[PDB]
């Protein structure tokens, strides 16, 4: 049945805004960091954390996080990937390693009803005048 705790990106947000040790971690490809941007969450109250996940480098990711968050079995880490990805495993990952709980904002970044498809703020990179549609 459900495992991984997941949901709606607004929920996160919501959670993120009630929550004093909520944070956002983008496991998103550095490449995804130049094209859609980074989450822009400061109107809460807190600070995004990039970290590219791998299932090579579970350890070496891992360790990533121990080393910026004082309690990690305290501080609830929401995931944020392009897509699904491994949002739901990395949720358990964290959970499993020590940390208190974790989020996998289900459709990804970039879905359907993503983190900008739920009218949620974000800071976008330096875009430029190029339409693509027909």
């Known amino acids: 049945g459900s495992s991984g705790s997941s949901g709606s990106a607004k929920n ?7 929550d004093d040790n909520a944070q956002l971690l983008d496991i998103r ?3 995804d960091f130049r094209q859609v941007g980074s989450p822009n969450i400061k109107g809460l109250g807190k600070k995004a954390v990039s ?4 299932g090579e480098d579970k350890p ?14 305290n501080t609830t880490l929401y ?14 990952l964290v959970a499993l390693n ?32 190029g339409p693509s549609s027909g």
């Open 98 to 129: 020590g940390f208190k709980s974790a989020y996998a904002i289900k459709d990804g970044a970039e879905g359907p009803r993503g983190w900008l498809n739920s009218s949620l703020p974000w800071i976008e990179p330096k875009k430029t005048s």
């Open 79 to 92: 995931i944020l990937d392009k897509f699904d990805g491994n949002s739901e495993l990395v949720a358990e």
């Open 12 to 18: 996160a947000y919501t959670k993120l805004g009630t």
């Open 60 to 73: 070496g990711f891992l360790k990533k996080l121990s080393l910026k968050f004082k309690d990690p079995e």
């Open 29 to 31: 490809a550095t490449a």
């Open 51 to 54: 970290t590219v996940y791998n």
